[PDB]
Amino acid sequence: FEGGQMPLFQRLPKRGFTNINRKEYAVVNLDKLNGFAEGTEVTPELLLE
Amino acid sequence: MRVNITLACTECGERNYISKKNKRNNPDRVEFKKYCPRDKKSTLHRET
Amino acid sequence: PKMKTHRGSAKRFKKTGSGKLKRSHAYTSHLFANKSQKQKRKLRKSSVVSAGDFKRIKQMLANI
RNA sequence: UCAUAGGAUAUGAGAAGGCAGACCCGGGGAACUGAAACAUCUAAGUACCCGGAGGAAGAGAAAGCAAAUGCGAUUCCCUGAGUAGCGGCGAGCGAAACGGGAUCAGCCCAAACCAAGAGGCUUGCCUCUUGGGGUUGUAGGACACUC
RNA sequence: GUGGAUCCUGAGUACGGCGGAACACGUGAAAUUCCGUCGGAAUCCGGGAGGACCAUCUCCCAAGGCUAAAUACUCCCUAGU
RNA sequence: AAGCAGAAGAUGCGGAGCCGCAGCGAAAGCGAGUCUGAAUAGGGCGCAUGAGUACGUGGUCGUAGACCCGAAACCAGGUGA
RNA sequence: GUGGGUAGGGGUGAAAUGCCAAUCGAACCUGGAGAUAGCUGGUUCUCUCCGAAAUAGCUUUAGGGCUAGCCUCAAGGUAAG
RNA sequence: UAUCCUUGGGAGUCAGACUGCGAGUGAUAAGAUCCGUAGUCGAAAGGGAAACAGCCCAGACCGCCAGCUAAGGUCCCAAAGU
RNA sequence: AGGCCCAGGCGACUGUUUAGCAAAAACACAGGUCUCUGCGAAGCCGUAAGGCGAAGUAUAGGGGCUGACGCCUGCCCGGUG
RNA sequence: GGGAUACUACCCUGGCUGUAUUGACCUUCUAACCCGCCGCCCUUAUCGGGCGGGGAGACAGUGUCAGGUGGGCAGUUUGACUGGGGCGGUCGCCUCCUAAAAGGUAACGGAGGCGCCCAAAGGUUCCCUCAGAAUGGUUGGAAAUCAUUCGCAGAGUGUAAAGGCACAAGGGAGCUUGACUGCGAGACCUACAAGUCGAGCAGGGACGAAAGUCGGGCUUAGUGAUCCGGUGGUUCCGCAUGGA
């Protein structure tokens, strides 16, 4: 509240939506892959462990 | 007195331009040759 | 009581990287025949909340 | 004076009323306040009033949750999350399921059909009390073949 | 346990209109639950839901009941802190 | 965390969950790039100039009556001819 | 005189806004309720360091509030001043 | 000469007044009002102008029975030149 | 155990009223007028049963206005009802 | 005269009768509903309640929905500046002075304007030049229209004032729609929200041979947040899936 002056969020309009279907993928970059040894198999489960 | 006019085109229907006109001075449906973005070329525009 | 966010501002601002806020522009609802094209196309683009308003606002958008 | 109302007699560790200002269900149900006024909204289904029982009450075994080599009664706690949403889209209001824990009980009818007795007869169209007759969804039970 | 000719599987009921209530949800794209008035089905080849609604697919069988424990609370009483 | 053991404790178990390490766009989505845009142009956005989490003190804020006293007044329930 | 009735979003009233238990333009008591109060009053031990403003803008705003200016503290940039 | 910028934490302030000078309004009236600019008070005690916030001189870390001085003053009250 | 007289407003009069500032020219009043109501009257209290009206019946009730008595009570239905 | 339509069986050119349904006017009764009507009984009872008679009667009342009326009643609103308030005036934007030779700077200080207009009063290309006065000339002049001379700007510049403009920004002619899309290095101003300029880049133009100009008016006014809703396009999402 700024003294009855019609506040900033009111002066600003609204933006777009969001969707119920949103597949945020688990990010991993290549530098994290160097920890595993040579010739090994990596799976999401082993990533979890 | 001046009325807003929204321009339209036959060579493609979706048009966008807003202009002004006097109903005494141009009672007739005006035409103008303009550049539509989606046709990517200059086209002839009527209004609604 | 865990503190409530403010939904009216949560529907209008986005927390970008480096902690700033992404906001839309005003004057883009229903008057367009009277404004020049230049200000309209500048107005289409987005902007960022200034420092003083951020100093006021920071609390009210604490929970992204 | 068909017969009922009503009336009379007897039998009833029957009810009422209180209570812990607590806790739970219902019925009824505000305003101040906030919105920097105010009517939508909020306060809040709060206080208060009424009725009822319990030592816990409600709820409870899917016309569910969900979208998968799927879970299998309720309830309650953490999480979901101040998220999705709702809202003079203001002020504010605001979830659920998946996951993890406490606990863990699943059952009984009505209907079909049979048996008698229960009469009206318009000979089963209905009696009413037993037992079989049974509680079921990639259907089950009556129905003909099983201890 | 098998078979499945035939019979049963909760009617003024679901549901709909109108006017309200509760669902976080203020009628809104408004499902769902209940109230009052009026209307008003289906019967296993049958019905209900999956947030308007319709087709496919999945789940389920309402309009009948009962059900302990995890739960809430202290006028009390005991022993303590 | 809840919870389970444990002197109303510590501590042990308990990875569900939470927050970062990647952003960009309303989104589908893409990715150290993304969006806008016809564009390999320009511009915006963290680039590249890699620390957060958990807990304690302190300062401040929010929701609670929130720094202490103060109304006239409103509503509900009762009590009085 | 005695015994009765009329109860406060009311009753009464040969009518004044009178009276309804010394109280009446809405009686008294309790509860909501620590109502709210942009207003007035108050706010308790010491020293050291630094040290303001009474302006602009906007406001159903004028004795109120927010931002900017002015202050303090901390970390950087360092030599821009 | 050393104070400037950026970020972050935490404020109070939105009633100002007077004296100069430059303007308004006023009757070139007001200890009037409203501006710009400078100072003081505000938030600054000490000396002077009798007493006195804004005028003049000058800034209080304490102590001394030390000196020099600014405004102002030196017959006395009352310190210093009848 | 009466002062009196002469005039003039105002109110016919006796009456009533702001307990606790105002007894008055204020209210009431008899009279007048308008209007509603055919009796499960109208009107009023109450949600409703019940009542009051009224164990009454347009010569009776309810409401509005004016206020003994004497003389009178003009014009306008454009507006509102 | 165009198809004179003379032996499918046309729609009816639209007419009516008999059959099954719907609304008002009608009269009735049981038969609902009602009776502060009467007789009997419950019952020594003016309550109600059983029978009978009667009267009304599908009306009423009552329930739900709807419209009108409705200070009888309830919650509320009724702005601010103000040389005390009320009353008067004003509230936004643009121009000048006040303004103290940068910018800024108040008052219920002093003067005006604006809530438009212009399909050309734009954009390019090309070409000019005013107002006024003197003298002649008729209708004709105080000025209508010509001719000469003087004439820095007195005239215009759509409109208020200010600034600037005759190398046009003033006037005239041709063509045309740049009064384009995507932008935008930077820069001013500013509390924020806003507002303003901008070279240059890309695509496609217009004018001109070209250089080059053009993202409206000669500059400054001619105008409003958000929410909500309408309209057009969408390579966006759309609650199991596919659509909506």
PDB file of N, CA, C and O (backbone and C1' of nucleotides) in Angstrom, chain J residues 24-42:
ATOM      1  P     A J  24     -57.561 -19.947 -18.876  1.00  0.00           P
ATOM      2  O5'   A J  24     -58.084 -18.534 -19.394  1.00  0.00           O
ATOM      3  C5'   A J  24     -59.215 -17.915 -18.804  1.00  0.00           C
ATOM      4  C4'   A J  24     -60.118 -17.310 -19.847  1.00  0.00           C
ATOM      5  C3'   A J  24     -61.601 -17.373 -19.537  1.00  0.00           C
ATOM      6  O3'   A J  24     -62.038 -16.369 -18.648  1.00  0.00           O
ATOM      7  C1'   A J  24     -61.238 -18.123 -21.741  1.00  0.00           C
ATOM      8  P     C J  25     -63.179 -16.722 -17.580  1.00  0.00           P
ATOM      9  O5'   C J  25     -64.511 -16.691 -18.442  1.00  0.00           O
ATOM     10  C5'   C J  25     -64.917 -15.495 -19.093  1.00  0.00           C
ATOM     11  C4'   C J  25     -66.347 -15.572 -19.553  1.00  0.00           C
ATOM     12  C3'   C J  25     -67.273 -16.392 -18.660  1.00  0.00           C
ATOM     13  O3'   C J  25     -68.539 -15.756 -18.558  1.00  0.00           O
ATOM     14  C1'   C J  25     -67.296 -17.265 -20.868  1.00  0.00           C
ATOM     15  P     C J  26     -69.395 -15.943 -17.215  1.00  0.00           P
ATOM     16  O5'   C J  26     -70.422 -17.097 -17.588  1.00  0.00           O
ATOM     17  C5'   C J  26     -70.703 -18.134 -16.666  1.00  0.00           C
ATOM     18  C4'   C J  26     -71.294 -19.329 -17.365  1.00  0.00           C
ATOM     19  C3'   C J  26     -71.450 -20.590 -16.531  1.00  0.00           C
ATOM     20  O3'   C J  26     -72.644 -20.602 -15.770  1.00  0.00           O
ATOM     21  C1'   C J  26     -70.481 -21.118 -18.632  1.00  0.00           C
ATOM     22  P     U J  27     -72.764 -19.790 -14.390  1.00  0.00           P
ATOM     23  O5'   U J  27     -73.831 -20.624 -13.565  1.00  0.00           O
ATOM     24  C5'   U J  27     -74.964 -21.181 -14.211  1.00  0.00           C
ATOM     25  C4'   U J  27     -75.017 -22.672 -14.009  1.00  0.00           C
ATOM     26  C3'   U J  27     -74.325 -23.162 -12.750  1.00  0.00           C
ATOM     27  O3'   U J  27     -75.166 -23.048 -11.614  1.00  0.00           O
ATOM     28  C1'   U J  27     -73.633 -24.462 -14.611  1.00  0.00           C
ATOM     29  P     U J  28     -74.843 -23.796 -10.233  1.00  0.00           P
ATOM     30  O5'   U J  28     -75.525 -25.219 -10.435  1.00  0.00           O
ATOM     31  C5'   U J  28     -75.419 -26.223  -9.447  1.00  0.00           C
ATOM     32  C4'   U J  28     -74.892 -27.504 -10.031  1.00  0.00           C
ATOM     33  C3'   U J  28     -73.834 -28.193  -9.201  1.00  0.00           C
ATOM     34  O3'   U J  28     -74.430 -28.984  -8.200  1.00  0.00           O
ATOM     35  C1'   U J  28     -73.218 -28.189 -11.501  1.00  0.00           C
ATOM     36  P     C J  29     -74.600 -28.454  -6.696  1.00  0.00           P
ATOM     37  O5'   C J  29     -74.414 -29.778  -5.835  1.00  0.00           O
ATOM     38  C5'   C J  29     -75.005 -30.995  -6.263  1.00  0.00           C
ATOM     39  C4'   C J  29     -73.971 -31.963  -6.777  1.00  0.00           C
ATOM     40  C3'   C J  29     -72.813 -32.241  -5.843  1.00  0.00           C
ATOM     41  O3'   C J  29     -73.104 -33.154  -4.806  1.00  0.00           O
ATOM     42  C1'   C J  29     -71.965 -31.798  -7.992  1.00  0.00           C
ATOM     43  P     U J  30     -72.872 -32.695  -3.285  1.00  0.00           P
ATOM     44  O5'   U J  30     -71.840 -33.757  -2.702  1.00  0.00           O
ATOM     45  C5'   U J  30     -72.117 -35.145  -2.764  1.00  0.00           C
ATOM     46  C4'   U J  30     -71.087 -35.855  -3.599  1.00  0.00           C
ATOM     47  C3'   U J  30     -69.687 -35.893  -3.019  1.00  0.00           C
ATOM     48  O3'   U J  30     -69.500 -36.913  -2.057  1.00  0.00           O
ATOM     49  C1'   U J  30     -69.576 -35.217  -5.278  1.00  0.00           C
ATOM     50  P     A J  31     -68.732 -36.584  -0.686  1.00  0.00           P
ATOM     51  O5'   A J  31     -67.386 -35.868  -1.146  1.00  0.00           O
ATOM     52  C5'   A J  31     -66.335 -36.590  -1.785  1.00  0.00           C
ATOM     53  C4'   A J  31     -65.324 -35.637  -2.365  1.00  0.00           C
ATOM     54  C3'   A J  31     -65.804 -34.190  -2.491  1.00  0.00           C
ATOM     55  O3'   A J  31     -64.812 -33.314  -1.984  1.00  0.00           O
ATOM     56  C1'   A J  31     -64.944 -34.962  -4.574  1.00  0.00           C
ATOM     57  P     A J  32     -64.891 -32.844  -0.456  1.00  0.00           P
ATOM     58  O5'   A J  32     -63.389 -32.993   0.041  1.00  0.00           O
ATOM     59  C5'   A J  32     -62.614 -34.119  -0.342  1.00  0.00           C
ATOM     60  C4'   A J  32     -61.365 -33.692  -1.060  1.00  0.00           C
ATOM     61  C3'   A J  32     -60.673 -32.484  -0.466  1.00  0.00           C
ATOM     62  O3'   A J  32     -59.852 -32.818   0.633  1.00  0.00           O
ATOM     63  C1'   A J  32     -60.876 -32.200  -2.795  1.00  0.00           C
ATOM     64  P     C J  33     -60.218 -32.258   2.088  1.00  0.00           P
ATOM     65  O5'   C J  33     -59.837 -30.719   2.001  1.00  0.00           O
ATOM     66  C5'   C J  33     -58.512 -30.316   1.703  1.00  0.00           C
ATOM     67  C4'   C J  33     -58.468 -28.857   1.350  1.00  0.00           C
ATOM     68  C3'   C J  33     -59.298 -27.957   2.248  1.00  0.00           C
ATOM     69  O3'   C J  33     -58.660 -27.622   3.462  1.00  0.00           O
ATOM     70  C1'   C J  33     -59.795 -27.471   0.001  1.00  0.00           C
ATOM     71  P     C J  34     -59.468 -27.785   4.837  1.00  0.00           P
ATOM     72  O5'   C J  34     -60.401 -26.503   4.873  1.00  0.00           O
ATOM     73  C5'   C J  34     -59.838 -25.217   4.701  1.00  0.00           C
ATOM     74  C4'   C J  34     -60.901 -24.159   4.616  1.00  0.00           C
ATOM     75  C3'   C J  34     -61.959 -24.202   5.696  1.00  0.00           C
ATOM     76  O3'   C J  34     -61.520 -23.633   6.911  1.00  0.00           O
ATOM     77  C1'   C J  34     -62.980 -23.866   3.593  1.00  0.00           C
ATOM     78  P     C J  35     -62.104 -24.176   8.302  1.00  0.00           P
ATOM     79  O5'   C J  35     -63.540 -23.502   8.399  1.00  0.00           O
ATOM     80  C5'   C J  35     -63.683 -22.094   8.369  1.00  0.00           C
ATOM     81  C4'   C J  35     -65.122 -21.708   8.181  1.00  0.00           C
ATOM     82  C3'   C J  35     -66.098 -22.367   9.131  1.00  0.00           C
ATOM     83  O3'   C J  35     -66.130 -21.736  10.392  1.00  0.00           O
ATOM     84  C1'   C J  35     -66.954 -22.436   6.926  1.00  0.00           C
ATOM     85  P     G J  36     -65.578 -22.504  11.684  1.00  0.00           P
ATOM     86  O5'   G J  36     -65.988 -21.555  12.888  1.00  0.00           O
ATOM     87  C5'   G J  36     -65.113 -20.526  13.308  1.00  0.00           C
ATOM     88  C4'   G J  36     -65.851 -19.252  13.626  1.00  0.00           C
ATOM     89  C3'   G J  36     -66.487 -18.538  12.444  1.00  0.00           C
ATOM     90  O3'   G J  36     -67.794 -19.026  12.198  1.00  0.00           O
ATOM     91  C1'   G J  36     -65.245 -16.998  13.766  1.00  0.00           C
ATOM     92  P     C J  37     -68.725 -18.396  11.052  1.00  0.00           P
ATOM     93  O5'   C J  37     -69.938 -19.417  10.966  1.00  0.00           O
ATOM     94  C5'   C J  37     -70.776 -19.633  12.088  1.00  0.00           C
ATOM     95  C4'   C J  37     -72.170 -19.988  11.650  1.00  0.00           C
ATOM     96  C3'   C J  37     -72.875 -21.050  12.480  1.00  0.00           C
ATOM     97  O3'   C J  37     -73.491 -20.518  13.638  1.00  0.00           O
ATOM     98  C1'   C J  37     -73.084 -21.567  10.181  1.00  0.00           C
ATOM     99  P     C J  38     -73.683 -21.429  14.945  1.00  0.00           P
ATOM    100  O5'   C J  38     -74.812 -22.467  14.532  1.00  0.00           O
ATOM    101  C5'   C J  38     -76.152 -22.045  14.344  1.00  0.00           C
ATOM    102  C4'   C J  38     -77.012 -23.182  13.866  1.00  0.00           C
ATOM    103  C3'   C J  38     -76.985 -24.431  14.727  1.00  0.00           C
ATOM    104  O3'   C J  38     -77.854 -24.342  15.838  1.00  0.00           O
ATOM    105  C1'   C J  38     -76.729 -25.026  12.453  1.00  0.00           C
ATOM    106  P     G J  39     -77.542 -25.178  17.170  1.00  0.00           P
ATOM    107  O5'   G J  39     -77.967 -26.667  16.803  1.00  0.00           O
ATOM    108  C5'   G J  39     -79.329 -27.061  16.829  1.00  0.00           C
ATOM    109  C4'   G J  39     -79.470 -28.540  16.583  1.00  0.00           C
ATOM    110  C3'   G J  39     -78.658 -29.439  17.497  1.00  0.00           C
ATOM    111  O3'   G J  39     -79.301 -29.679  18.729  1.00  0.00           O
ATOM    112  C1'   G J  39     -78.348 -30.111  15.263  1.00  0.00           C
ATOM    113  P     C J  40     -78.429 -29.984  20.036  1.00  0.00           P
ATOM    114  O5'   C J  40     -77.916 -31.471  19.816  1.00  0.00           O
ATOM    115  C5'   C J  40     -78.828 -32.555  19.783  1.00  0.00           C
ATOM    116  C4'   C J  40     -78.132 -33.825  19.379  1.00  0.00           C
ATOM    117  C3'   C J  40     -76.969 -34.232  20.262  1.00  0.00           C
ATOM    118  O3'   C J  40     -77.396 -34.948  21.401  1.00  0.00           O
ATOM    119  C1'   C J  40     -76.348 -34.385  17.980  1.00  0.00           C
ATOM    120  P     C J  41     -76.655 -34.740  22.804  1.00  0.00           P
ATOM    121  O5'   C J  41     -75.305 -35.559  22.644  1.00  0.00           O
ATOM    122  C5'   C J  41     -75.335 -36.963  22.465  1.00  0.00           C
ATOM    123  C4'   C J  41     -74.004 -37.480  21.991  1.00  0.00           C
ATOM    124  C3'   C J  41     -72.809 -37.108  22.849  1.00  0.00           C
ATOM    125  O3'   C J  41     -72.665 -37.966  23.967  1.00  0.00           O
ATOM    126  C1'   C J  41     -72.304 -36.771  20.553  1.00  0.00           C
ATOM    127  P     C J  42     -71.949 -37.448  25.306  1.00  0.00           P
ATOM    128  O5'   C J  42     -70.397 -37.476  24.945  1.00  0.00           O
ATOM    129  C5'   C J  42     -69.750 -38.707  24.665  1.00  0.00           C
ATOM    130  C4'   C J  42     -68.410 -38.514  23.999  1.00  0.00           C
ATOM    131  C3'   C J  42     -67.351 -37.786  24.802  1.00  0.00           C
ATOM    132  O3'   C J  42     -66.751 -38.597  25.788  1.00  0.00           O
ATOM    133  C1'   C J  42     -67.345 -36.996  22.577  1.00  0.00           C
TER     134        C J  42
END
